[PDB]
Amino acid sequence: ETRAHAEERLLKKLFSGYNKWSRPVANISDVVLVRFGLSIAQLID
């Protein structure tokens, strides 16, 4: 009932059958879109 317990149940259900190295896509022919962005903290030297 508490929020932390609900998040724990979600995290337990989610990672049951998830494989890291497998590329997650619906079909093989479909692609993924990786939106990429940069930010400069400082120019050291």
């Binding site: 508490t2 929020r3 932390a4 998040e7 724990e8 995290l11 903290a41 400082q42 050291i44 030297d45």
Partner: protein, 115 residues
């Protein structure tokens, strides 16, 4: 003997989880009180604009699922716990140079009965 059973009781993987933070009453904010104390000021490379210091940052925060009944466990007020296991908020220099960001030793953490 009792400390072993107490630490096994508190740090049970099925009962305590490292990933999710503790929260109560509809996502109330968990306050973290940090204060710095520098031991020695190592160096100030003015040519490279780099200040190297040795720092102890002391952090306090409340956590509710770590509470235990003190009377049952032989009236223990405080216990040591490894920092790697229990949850901890990440605090790091935001403008840090030289790559190194987080703390070095990961010292043990004191935990009282209040939480």
């Amino acid at each position: 003997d009792t400390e072993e059973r107490l630490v096994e009781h508190l740090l049970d993987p099925s009962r305590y989880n490292k990933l999710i933070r503790p929260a109560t009453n509809g996502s109330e904010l968990v306050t973290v009180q940090l204060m710095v104390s520098l031991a020695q000021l190592i160096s100030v490379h003015e040519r490279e604009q780099i200040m190297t210091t040795n720092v102890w940052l002391t952090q306090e925060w409340e956590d509710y699922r770590l509470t235990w009944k003190p009377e049952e466990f032989d009236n223990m007020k405080k216990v040591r716990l490894p920092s790697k296991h229990i949850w901890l908020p990440d605090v790091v220099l935001y403008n840090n140079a030289d790559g190194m960001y987080e703390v070095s030793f990961y010292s043990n953490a004191v935990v009282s009965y209040d939480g």
